[PDB]
């Protein structure tokens, strides 16, 4: 789970 939406996820 990330606080932000990540481009490479």
């Amino acid at each position: 789970s990330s606080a932000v939406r990540l481009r490479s996820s």
């Epitope: 789970s1 990330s2 606080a3 932000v4 939406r5 990540l6 481009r7 490479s8």
Partner: antibody
């Protein structure tokens, strides 16, 4: 801070194209580049991105297997390659700057190339 | 894919009056992690590249005049011009950058006259 693209390219049906995007005024490796195309009088279509530092890419499913995106940091340029051109590929190809890679948060496209007008025609 | 649809296709407004464009996404672009909408609006004039106006639903870019504002959350967004100026005639596009593919809709804005 800008992205430089050539005005126009004319290619033949069935041929390959290679559209460049030369970065200015910032560090080439630190941002994602995106390609967005616009057929005459129509919408914007997102094609894919490239993280120039690592060459890692992601393409929209409909362009998978006919596109590539590559980077040459020695000339601060990144390239869109597409094969099997048809009349439906006639469009303006814009490159645009998104996400700052060290932080990697998905970002809107703040800086755009003027676009390369690509005409597929014999 | 997240499908974006703008309403209306075409908008006519008298100079000095309020113009509003709607966008709907087929899925929410609101991230639980930071409570941010990964939603932008772009202006495109005839023969030019798109220009980013608004990111995060409502954050104006540097130099975008404050007659432009954005609103909405999740799946439903508006771009509002409080007072239409001549320089604002353009096509306006929404975009989600929540997940790839990073999709656009399309919206045409003109001056209304007799």
């Amino acid at each position: 801070v800008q992205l430089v693209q050539p005005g126009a390219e004319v290619m033949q049906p069935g041929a390959s194209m290679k559209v460049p995007c030369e970065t200015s005024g910032y560090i080439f490796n630190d941002y994602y580049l995106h390609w967005v195309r616009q057929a005459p009088g129509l919408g914007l279509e997102w094609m894919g991105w490239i993280a120039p530092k690592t060459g890692v890419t992601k393409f929209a499913q409909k362009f998978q297997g006919r596109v590539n995106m590559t980077a040459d940091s020695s000339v601060n340029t990144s390239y869109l390659e597409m094969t099997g051109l048809t009349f439906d590929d006639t469009a303006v190809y814009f490159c645009a700057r998104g996400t700052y890679l060290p932080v990697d948060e998905s970002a809107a496209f703040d800086v755009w190339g003027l676009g390369t007008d690509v005409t597929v025609s014999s | 894919d997240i499908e974006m649809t703008q309403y209306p296709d075409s908008l006519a407004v008298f100079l000095g009056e309020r113009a509003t464009v709607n966008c709907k996404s087929s899925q929410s672009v609101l991230h639980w992690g930071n409570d941010k909408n990964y939603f932008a609006w772009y202006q495109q004039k005839r023969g030019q590249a798109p220009k980013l106006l608004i990111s995060s639903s409502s954050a104006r870019e540097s130099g975008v005049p404050d007659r432009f504002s954005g609103s909405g959350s999740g799946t439903d967004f508006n771009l509002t011009i409080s007072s239409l100026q001549a320089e604002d005639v353009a096509v306006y596009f929404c975009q989600q950058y929540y997940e790839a593919p990073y999709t656009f809709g399309q919206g045409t804005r003109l001056e209304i006259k007799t």
